[PDB]
Amino acid sequence: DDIQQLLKKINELTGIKESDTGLAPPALWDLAADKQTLQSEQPLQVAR
Amino acid sequence: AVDTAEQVYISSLALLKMLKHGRAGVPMEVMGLMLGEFVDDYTVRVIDVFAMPQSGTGVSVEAVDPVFQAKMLDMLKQTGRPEMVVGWYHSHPGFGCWLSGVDINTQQSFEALSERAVAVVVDPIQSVKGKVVIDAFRLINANMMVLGHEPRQTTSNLGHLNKPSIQALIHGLNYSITINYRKNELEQKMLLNLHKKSWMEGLTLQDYSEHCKHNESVVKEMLELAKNYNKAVEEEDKMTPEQLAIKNVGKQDPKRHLEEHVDVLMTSNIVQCLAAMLDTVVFK
Amino acid sequence: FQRCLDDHKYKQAIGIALETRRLDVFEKTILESNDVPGMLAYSLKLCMSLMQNKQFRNKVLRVLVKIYMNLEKPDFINVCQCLIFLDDPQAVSDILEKLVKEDNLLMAYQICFDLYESASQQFLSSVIQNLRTDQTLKMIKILSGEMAIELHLQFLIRNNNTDLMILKNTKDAVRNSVCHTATVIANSFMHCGTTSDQFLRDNLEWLARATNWAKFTATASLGVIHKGHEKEALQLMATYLPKDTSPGSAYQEGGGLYALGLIHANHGGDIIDYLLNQLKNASNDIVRHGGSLGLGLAAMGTARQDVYDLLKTNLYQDDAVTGEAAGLALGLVMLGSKNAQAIEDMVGYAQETQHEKILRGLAVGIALVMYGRMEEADALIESLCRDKDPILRRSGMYTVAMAYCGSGNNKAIRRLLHVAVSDVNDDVRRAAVESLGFILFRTPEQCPSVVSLLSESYNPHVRYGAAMALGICCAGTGNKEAINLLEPMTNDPVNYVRQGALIASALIMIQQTEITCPKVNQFRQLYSKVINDKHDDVMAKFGAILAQGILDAGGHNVTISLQSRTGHTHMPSVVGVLVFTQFWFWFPLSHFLSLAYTPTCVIGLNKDLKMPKVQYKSNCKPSTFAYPAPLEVPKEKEKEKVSTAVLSITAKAKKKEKEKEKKPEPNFQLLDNPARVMPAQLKVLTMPETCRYQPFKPLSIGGIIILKDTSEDIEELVEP
Amino acid sequence: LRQYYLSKIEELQLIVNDKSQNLRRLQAQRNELNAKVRLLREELQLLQEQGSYVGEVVRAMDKKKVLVKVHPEGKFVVDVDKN
Amino acid sequence: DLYSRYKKLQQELEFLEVQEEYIKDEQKNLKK
Numbered sequence A: 001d002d003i004q005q006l007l008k009k010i011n012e013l014t015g016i017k018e019s020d021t022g023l024a025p026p027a028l029w030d031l032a033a034d035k036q037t038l039q040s041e042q043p044l045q046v047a048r
Numbered sequence B: 001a002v003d004t005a006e007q008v009y010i011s012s013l014a015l016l017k018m019l020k021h022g023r024a025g026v027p028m029e030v031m032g033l034m035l036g037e038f039v040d041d042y043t044v045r046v047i048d049v050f051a052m053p054q055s056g057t058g059v060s061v062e063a064v065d066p067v068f069q070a071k072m073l074d075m076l077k078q079t080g081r082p083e084m085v086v087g088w089y090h091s092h093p094g095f096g097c098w099l100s101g102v103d104i105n106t107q108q109s110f111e112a113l114s115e116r117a118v119a120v121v122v123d124p125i126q127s128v129k130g131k132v133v134i135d136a137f138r139l140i141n142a143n144m145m146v147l148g149h150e151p152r153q154t155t156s157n158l159g160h161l162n163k164p165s166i167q168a169l170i171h172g173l174n175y176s177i178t179i180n181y182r183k184n185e186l187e188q189k190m191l192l193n194l195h196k197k198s199w200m201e202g203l204t205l206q207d208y209s210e211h212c213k214h215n216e217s218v219v220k221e222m223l224e225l226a227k228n229y230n231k232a233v234e235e236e237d238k239m240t241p242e243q244l245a246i247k248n249v250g251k252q253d254p255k256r257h258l259e260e261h262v263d264v265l266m267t268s269n270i271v272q273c274l275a276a277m278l279d280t281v282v283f284k
Numbered sequence C: 001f002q003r004c005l006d007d008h009k010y011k012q013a014i015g016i017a018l019e020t021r022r023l024d025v026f027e028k029t030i031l032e033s034n035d036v037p038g039m040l041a042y043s044l045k046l047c048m049s050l051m052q053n054k055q056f057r058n059k060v061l062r063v064l065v066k067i068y069m070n071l072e073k074p075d076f077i078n079v080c081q082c083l084i085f086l087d088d089p090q091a092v093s094d095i096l097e098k099l100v101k102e103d104n105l106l107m108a109y110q111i112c113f114d115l116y117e118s119a120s121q122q123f124l125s126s127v128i129q130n131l132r133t134d135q136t137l138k139m140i141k142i143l144s145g146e147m148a149i150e151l152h153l154q155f156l157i158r159n160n161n162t163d164l165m166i167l168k169n170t171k172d173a174v175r176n177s178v179c180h181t182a183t184v185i186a187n188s189f190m191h192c193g194t195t196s197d198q199f200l201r202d203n204l205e206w207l208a209r210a211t212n213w214a215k216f217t218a219t220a221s222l223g224v225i226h227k228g229h230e231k232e233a234l235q236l237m238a239t240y241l242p243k244d245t246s247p248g249s250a251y252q253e254g255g256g257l258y259a260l261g262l263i264h265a266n267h268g269g270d271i272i273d274y275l276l277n278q279l280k281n282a283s284n285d286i287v288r289h290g291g292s293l294g295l296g297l298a299a300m301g302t303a304r305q306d307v308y309d310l311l312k313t314n315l316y317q318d319d320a321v322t323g324e325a326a327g328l329a330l331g332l333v334m335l336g337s338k339n340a341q342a343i344e345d346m347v348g349y350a351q352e353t354q355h356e357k358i359l360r361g362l363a364v365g366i367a368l369v370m371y372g373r374m375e376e377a378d379a380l381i382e383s384l385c386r387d388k389d390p391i392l393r394r395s396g397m398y399t400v401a402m403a404y405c406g407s408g409n410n411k412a413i414r415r416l417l418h419v420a421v422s423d424v425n426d427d428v429r430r431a432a433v434e435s436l437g438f439i440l441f442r443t444p445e446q447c448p449s450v451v452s453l454l455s456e457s458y459n460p461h462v463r464y465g466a467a468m469a470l471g472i473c474c475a476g477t478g479n480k481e482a483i484n485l486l487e488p489m490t491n492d493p494v495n496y497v498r499q500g501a502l503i504a505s506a507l508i509m510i511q512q513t514e515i516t517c518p519k520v521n522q523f524r525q526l527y528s529k530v531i532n533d534k535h536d537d538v539m540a541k542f543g544a545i546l547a548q549g550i551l552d553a554g555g556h557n558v559t560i561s562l563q564s565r566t567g568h569t570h571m572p573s574v575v576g577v578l579v580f581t582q583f584w585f586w587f588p589l590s591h592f593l594s595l596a597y598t599p600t601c602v603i604g605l606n607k608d609l610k611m612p613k614v615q616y617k618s619n620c621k622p623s624t625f626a627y628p629a630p631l632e633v634p635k636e637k638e639k640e641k642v643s644t645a646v647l648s649i650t651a652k653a654k655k656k657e658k659e660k661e662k663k664p665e666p667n668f669q670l671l672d673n674p675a676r677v678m679p680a681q682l683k684v685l686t687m688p689e690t691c692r693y694q695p696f697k698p699l700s701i702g703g704i705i706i707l708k709d710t711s712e713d714i715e716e717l718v719e720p
Numbered sequence D: 001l002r003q004y005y006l007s008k009i010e011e012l013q014l015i016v017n018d019k020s021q022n023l024r025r026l027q028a029q030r031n032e033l034n035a036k037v038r039l040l041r042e043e044l045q046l047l048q049e050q051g052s053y054v055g056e057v058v059r060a061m062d063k064k065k066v067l068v069k070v071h072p073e074g075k076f077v078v079d080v081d082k083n
Numbered sequence E: 001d002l003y004s005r006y007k008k009l010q011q012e013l014e015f016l017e018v019q020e021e022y023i024k025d026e027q028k029n030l031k032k
């Protein structure tokens, strides 16, 4: 029973993470990966 | 050159006109310039406000069409006073009390014209029943960068109650100028139960046949409440009293069905008798 | 009455006479057997406590002074107190003339000392004027209180054991929120008159980061910090003249004038003319405020016509801040006077104006323009309480408050509670309770009950209320009842409510360790945590920091008590508490808390001016005192470790291997001469007979007491 | 004057106590009726704040990010509160 | 003493009366 209750703690504290991908490495374009983005936002109204 | 906890005083007639004009055109958006007096460096007061016909694509810099702006402020002084334009109606029917980029663009020019003018936002949909959503706003200076936190200051005085609302946080925020309604004693003498007092209708006896039916309708269920009270009085026989007497649901009798009924029966059956006997001697 | 005399128990006789308005039997009971020659003391206490009708109290106390003069050796202290309360400058001058003729120098010096301790200017002023119209010069000098100022300033400096570790902790934990003024105010409260303000001198970017009226805080913080240095205070101001680098920072100059005026708080001289000229000609707007708030303090109580005209002309020159400053200045300038025309004009203008700051301050100004008349205010109180303007209604409430300060008047409490129950405006609703303490303070035993209910009501704007109300009622003592009541009050969801509650608690537990209330540590830890957290209310943290700064005042030497040790109420202390109670309408005024600081020290003056050295000792049984304040540790620890959890069969091997491997306090100490003596022990100390002299004044009080002059050639003739 | 002076003290002591416990009774129900003015007052404010939405979570992404699925609309990458 | 006790109780009765009215007024207002 202790082993069964210990597996739960171990996985709970090492849970499924590092899965929120979708981010290009802000190193190849790190320089532009910045306030330039905000400049992209605000102007350039999104059309339909 | 710095704001504080400053009070904007809107007249009772001003508030009434704001609400009426807002509700008249709820589906659309309305605009109305404000007239008032610049009392002092921490007191901006508006005595009365006037509306501008709903033209243009909406609230914008078109509401200040000089042809209409000049002629009203003019004729208005002929009879009354010139209180300089101080603010604007604006109105957001279902959009909380926020200010959008177009609204900021508009109020920018008004700020230019004045130095401390205010922009009001009166919600004609959410504000009902006993709610007034009238919040006053000002344009944060373009020198945001680094400065004393906001131009609010708030160091001069501690008047800050009614902290910021919810939606304005989501939308553009950080002013929220505090608003305090002036009420002359006369202005509330009317608008009082002058609105609904009764006039002389207290000396009315109430439909007697109706009374003798209401009384039975109430006492008959008072009987049921009495049966329930007996049942609940046999309870508390040392089984789990502390927990059970509180965990028993069902509108405990002598709090919602045996007390309120007695209080209503007393008042009705006594007022009726008092009126009856008073008229038994007033008229001969 | 003859029956009582036969019984020989004359306490009942004295009581019955005092009740029955039989001054004949009253005089007889003392002219008859003076058994327990302290019967004079009992008569004094029972006439100064359980007596209200002034028309009879004055007659009874005149009879008392008659008996005292008629005894073999008149009591200097009793006679001086009675004369102070009668307000008989002629009698005071007569007594000083008689004593100087008799040359009882110990009694003379103690009389002057007690007088300046108890009465108020325009009484001491009358005495000094009459005496003017060589020893006489010394007596006048002492009476003016300047020598007292030097002496007790020297005490404050010579026990300037202020901490700074907490100051630095607050600096580190202080964000760019309003806490800037909070820290500045804490420093100002800490260093009241200590002439030791090093942190701001070393660092200046922080004290420089502020705005127009944020800067006004630091100026007056410095002014307070240097309380009592009239010798070169003008030199200090001139060193801080506004034209040092740029004349455009008018805020700085206004603040500097404010600081100077407070520095002369209840003292004038050429500084009065200086401020008068500065106000007559100065910058446009803010400089007027600084000049006004300086003049108000510098002429506080003077009631001089010329300054009055200057302030009147200022006020009737409308302006947003200048109007309120002028109103306060006028109130201070004419306090406890009831100038018929003064009140008429002030009230009329308050009605006429329309800038809701000039009248915002004029409310308190008018309420102050009359003090403690105790009956002569009914007209004004009713007239103002019937007004339409809520601000003026508040003003009327403040006036009904101070008009009865120091007395537990039943009708006053009735009116205040009625207004607090059945008013419409929140400012009035609060001022009601906030001013309740000023009346239910002199006997801080019943204010617990009178507040125990309202402190839990729906309107937090009115619950704030009892917070400061208790804070002022049980001001100088930790009654331990207000402690229980306010303990939860520090945890209300109304941020301003807690902001008031914390400051009230701090004032309640002022300078009193766990001797009075064993929760001082708990409250300080609570304050530290509340200031530490980054999610608590901003104004709540401001209140907490103000509480921390005011906790220890003047390095644990100055306390708050509106009454002299003799029981005479102190115009500056009461005015300060009122002015601060007008707190959450103008932060800059918070500095007025300075005036209510009562230094706790004993001055064993022996010569005319020397302060001979001695070493007292104390014998208090259950209570320590005198700077417990163990806050002398960096308390900067950090482990950053993880505790083991190894638990397997290996525990047995661990156990076997482990077996194999293993097989002075205070309350009876001594004390120096000019050492702080807390009022909790002002009556249980020890007489140090070792040195050659003894205090002819009875030793149950604090304050400067002149000892008997023995033979010369004594040891340790030191005058630091 | 023990016959009388003590006579008055009792004459104004026993009576005055009755005005002591009376103060509690007036104090007791006040708070109770104060309870009602709160148990029924706060309910109104906490009944006028915009309601919540109902959704189905899927594949809790890296801590502090989830993927809910609202009923009419699409899947939103919602945050996670501190509780 | 025996007169001071009486004076103390007179004052206390006065101050309790000065509350037996405030509580009732607050009760009326809170009922409203």
Ligand SMILES: [Zn+2]
Residues within 6 Å of the ligand: B059, B090, B091, B092, B099, B100, B103
């Ligand atoms: Zn808009």
